[PDB]
Amino acid sequence: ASIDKQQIAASVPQRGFFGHPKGLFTLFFTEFWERFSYYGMRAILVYYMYYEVSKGGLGLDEHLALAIMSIYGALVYMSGIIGGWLADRVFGTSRAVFYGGLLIMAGHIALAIPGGVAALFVSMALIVLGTGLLKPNVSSIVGDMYKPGDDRRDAGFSIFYMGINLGAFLAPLVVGTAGMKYNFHLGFGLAAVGMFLGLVVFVATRKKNLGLAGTYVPNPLTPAEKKKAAAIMAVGAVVIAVLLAILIPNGWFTVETFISLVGILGIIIPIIYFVVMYRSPKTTAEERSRVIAYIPLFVASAMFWAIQEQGSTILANYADKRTQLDVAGIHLSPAWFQSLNPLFIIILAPVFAWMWVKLGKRQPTIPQKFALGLLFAGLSFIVILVPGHLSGGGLVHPIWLVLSYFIVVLGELCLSPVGLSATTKLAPAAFSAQTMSLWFLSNAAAQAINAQLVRFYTPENETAYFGTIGGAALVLGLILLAIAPRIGRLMK
């Protein structure tokens, strides 16, 4: 069922979008609108959860809301593992994107209509499932557009991914303005319309613009395999069944239990995977040493992403509860702070890229870049604790929060661009197809862990919260710097 790549590309019109195939238009806008809706939703979801019922919110406790926001991205990660497999072995990528988009749209609709906490659960379920099918598969469709040897490939991916930060930047300003200044459901409704526009362009244009791309099942199941995969689903169905019979009668079937389970998995899954890689009979002794060398990089990544990802949880709460939004005559919406990360990435990325070129042979190695990322991340938390500590109370000027987001980006631009490269360089050849998942696992584990850290975040513990986590990142960054020479030399 796999198709020759040149034959696939021959079915795709080769021009029509800035010198690229017209299908890049299709894929760019599908992805932009999916990201717009996801980030727009996220920008207001935390406030929707904890705002008073009389203020249009759900009225949950801040800690519970923050913990729920925290695990969201970890769930998306797990879903994406399943969704990548489903596309590869069952649907193909084009159908995965279609069905995924449908579920995501339904998820946004569930929040746009009048409803409460049950609707929140349903919305998250649909968006987690849908995003898992769409997110890790949409990029494989762009690759299918360029025949082997086509030198526009890299640039096309670059244009494609630019839609992520564009969506991330515009959504809080549009959806966040609507949701916060006027009505939450209006905000969520605009996210739904956004996803709808994405679906429309995809459905209306995919046949002509994309041809065969992603329309085939690359790794189809044999009849026996389909029965085998059906059996495994039944095993998973037995596992959930047996859990319910234990959890429900004992009153343990709660969101709190689930959050704690996500946390446990955040720790256990990485450990298990490292043992699997280290103990594999399909590895060499040299590869085994490299797996060990990767451990501090994985930990540094997790710690870095813990801080960076709190920009949309803890720091979103900080924007709303601790920051003076009434500066000059204008009233800032706290949702708007979610635009800072992508803005600064867009502005600073080419400057960093230029910097590395100019440094040349003098530039930091990959492990050194991880370390620098961590140091900046730690610094961003030290910076944020200062105004609250100096004031002794009351709202703080929003400039301090801006500076914190900015400093995190300095670190992100050190660590993140070499993350996959580090992972590929240190992972065994037998595990080469899982390198992306392994790299993304450090970010997902960070989010799972973030959710457990939420209860330490209170007005009275704010200084200790930011200082301890910031200090831990500083300490770990320093240690990583120190052991970076040996790690760097082991890299393939």
Side-chain angles (χ1 to χ4, degrees), residues 293-304:
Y294 187 63
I295 296 166
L297 294 196
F298 182 92
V299 171
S301 182
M303 172 77 81
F304 172 83

Side-chain angles (χ1 to χ4, degrees), residues 61 233 363:
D61 140 77
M233 294 180 60
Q363 74 166 334

Side-chain angles (χ1 to χ4, degrees), residues 60-94 96-106:
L60 302 182
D61 140 77
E62 275 164 276
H63 276 165
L64 180 59
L66 285 169
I68 294 171
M69 273 300 278
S70 295
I71 66 175
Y72 209 139
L75 295 176
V76 167
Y77 169 77
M78 302 170 178
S79 185
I81 298 291
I82 304 289
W85 187 90
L86 284 171
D88 189 68
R89 315 222 65 184
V90 184
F91 294 148
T93 57
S94 192
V97 171
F98 177 62
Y99 294 141
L102 286 180
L103 293 164
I104 293 170
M105 193 189 60

Side-chain angles (χ1 to χ4, degrees), residues 42-94 96-206 208-225 229-237 239-250:
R42 271 195 74 88
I44 58 176
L45 189 67
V46 63
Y47 308 129
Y48 179 60
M49 293 192 275
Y50 74 72
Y51 269 38
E52 309 159 53
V53 177
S54 58
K55 296 278 252 251
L58 262 18
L60 302 182
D61 140 77
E62 275 164 276
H63 276 165
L64 180 59
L66 285 169
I68 294 171
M69 273 300 278
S70 295
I71 66 175
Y72 209 139
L75 295 176
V76 167
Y77 169 77
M78 302 170 178
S79 185
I81 298 291
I82 304 289
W85 187 90
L86 284 171
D88 189 68
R89 315 222 65 184
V90 184
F91 294 148
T93 57
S94 192
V97 171
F98 177 62
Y99 294 141
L102 286 180
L103 293 164
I104 293 170
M105 193 189 60
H108 290 296
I109 288 166
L111 290 177
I113 67 195
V117 171
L120 199 223
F121 188 10
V122 170
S123 170
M124 294 187 54
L126 300 167
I127 293 169
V128 167
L129 295 182
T131 306
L133 287 161
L134 161 349
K135 190 192 214 186
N137 288 315
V138 63
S139 298
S140 300
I141 313 187
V142 14
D144 264 7
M145 298 190 309
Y146 305 88
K147 71 172 72 54
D150 193 317
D151 210 44
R152 302 129 80 216
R153 190 182 188 91
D154 294 352
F157 275 97
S158 177
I159 295 173
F160 177 77
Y161 291 124
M162 195 181 315
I164 295 175
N165 277 333
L166 219 271
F169 169 72
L170 295 174
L173 302 175
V174 173
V175 171
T177 292
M180 302 311 288
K181 307 273 176 132
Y182 301 87
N183 178 272
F184 280 114
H185 298 296
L186 175 56
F188 295 123
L190 292 178
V193 172
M195 189 61 246
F196 173 72
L197 300 165
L199 268 175
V200 169
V201 177
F202 189 73
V203 169
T205 67
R206 114 238 242 185
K208 228 186 101 305
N209 294 7
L210 290 179
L212 288 174
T215 66
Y216 53 91
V217 186
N219 207 218
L221 268 8
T222 61
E225 273 175 316
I232 288 177
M233 294 180 60
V235 163
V239 170
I240 169 68
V242 93
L243 271 173
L244 292 173
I246 297 176
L247 290 178
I248 300 176
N250 286 305

